[PDB]
Design a protein around this ligand. Structure first.
Ligand SMILES: [Zn+2]
Length: 99
């Protein structure tokens, strides 16, 4: 039994946090979450509003709000993302999924 998750990042170039940060150069004024937290959690900015995607799983999120936790949102929506699991561990993800 079992297909395996592919090991290739959706967008390998955006694999660098520093590079991910650059993408937030036009992260909007009305946006409510800081790019540092976003880039750290693997997201980079696309489009001109508040859409982001994870460089690894390509999970796409928008409508960011004051207090929203990027790492948490990550585990909420894309539990199997290998970047999320290497960075935060099995327990953290399981913890967010179970609530
Ligand atoms: Zn991801």
């Amino acid at each position: 039994a079992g297909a395996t998750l592919s090991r290739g990042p959706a967008f390998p170039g955006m694999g660098s946090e520093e590079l991910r940060l650059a993408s937030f150069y036009d992260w909007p004024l009305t946006a409510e979450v800081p790019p540092e937290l976003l880039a750290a959690a693997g997201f980079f900015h696309t489009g001109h509003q508040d859409k982001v995607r994870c460089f690894f799983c390509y999970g796409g999120l928008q409508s960011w709000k004051r207090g929203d936790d990027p790492w948490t949102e990550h585990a909420k929506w894309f539990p199997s993302c290998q970047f999320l699991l290497r960075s935060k561990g099995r327990d953290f993800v399981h913890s967010v999924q179970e609530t």
